[PDB]
Design a protein around this ligand. Sequence first.
Ligand SMILES: Cc1cc2nc3c(=O)[nH]c(=O)nc-3n(C[C@H](O)[C@H](O)[C@H](O)COP(=O)(O)O)c2cc1C
Length: 383
Amino acid sequence: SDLVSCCYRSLAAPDLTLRDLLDIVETSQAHNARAQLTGALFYSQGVFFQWLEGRPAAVAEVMTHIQRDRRHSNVEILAEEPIAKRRFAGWHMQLSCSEADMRSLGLSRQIVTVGRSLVADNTNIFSFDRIAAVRRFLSDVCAARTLAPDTPVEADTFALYALTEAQAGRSGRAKAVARLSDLLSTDPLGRLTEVEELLRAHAPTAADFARLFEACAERLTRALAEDRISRMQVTLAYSALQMALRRIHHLPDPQKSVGAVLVAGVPGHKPILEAALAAEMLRAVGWSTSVVHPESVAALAARLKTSRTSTLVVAPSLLEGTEQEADTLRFVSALRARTDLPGLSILVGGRLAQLPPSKLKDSGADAGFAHLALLPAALARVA
Ligand SMILES: Cc1cc2nc3c(=O)[nH]c(=O)nc-3n(C[C@H](O)[C@H](O)[C@H](O)COP(=O)(O)O)c2cc1C
């Protein structure tokens, strides 16, 4: 064989255009054609996924050029594996995007469309699941169109691929959450290294961290309710998770950002972890993010009229939910009163996000996110 594959994820420049994508595609088609390289490029919501395959040397040279490119950043290698045969034969470099992005760019082949519509807000689908699903989908589309070019492929076909991948990971993840919840319930600080290793194994990205945390959080809320653990135990666990998070994920603020956002807790609530996660998730898709733990409504009012950052995410406290709801209500309402900013947007999580959007209108908050991992998606909608 002697064929190799390389795949990475990167953050497209915030000012990226169709002309750029097309230039990349033409350059890449030409060069890959000469150098005997194949693969696919997937663009969705400011993010690139790419797969490249060929002889080792070719892949290495082209990666040398790509890494230094200035139309994207945070290139993270995801795989460098030997393959038995090409997954994208005939595709020197084929472009593809999500259905939503197809709408946003005004496109309608030859660009392979991926319908994420049905699975995008499914919290059981982890990051690597989406990546592998995209890979398999595109490889298959490549085969198909190699056989029957004028035979169109349904975008929403991808959904099944994604769901299938997630389902493959489900059991193992359940084990992980169980083991984890046990650790957090016993001595999370005495066994922090184990917590970290688990998290590191099962949560490659920050959103994954968020999924695991939601699961553990309901487990522990149940445990605390049934008086099986103490409040002190929950505080310990919370600390342990903050430490583990910071050790593992700690993205710098993106220099070229899609926008700026303020993440704040409600005064008295200490959503330290949830705010950190929110910041990590938003940073990972290209948002400039600031975390604030204000102690008065007025403080935040000042910071907002100073920043002129028209977007505010109120991070929920998923472990102090005795009175998160009415507190958040009062807080957002108060904030809206002391504020004179027609462009201001507010997003809310927790139990408040579980209410029907009618209540959301009534709330003065603009939109909700019933699960942490849904936050990026919820933000893009308002933008
Ligand atoms: C997301 C992305 C994917 C790219 N993929 C390829 C590729 O598969 N093959 C290629 O030759 N260039 C690719 N490029 C372009 C290279 O980064 C770079 O423009 C080119 O290889 C060097 O230009 P040259 O034609 O003067 O050698 C890609 C660029 C970006 C931003």
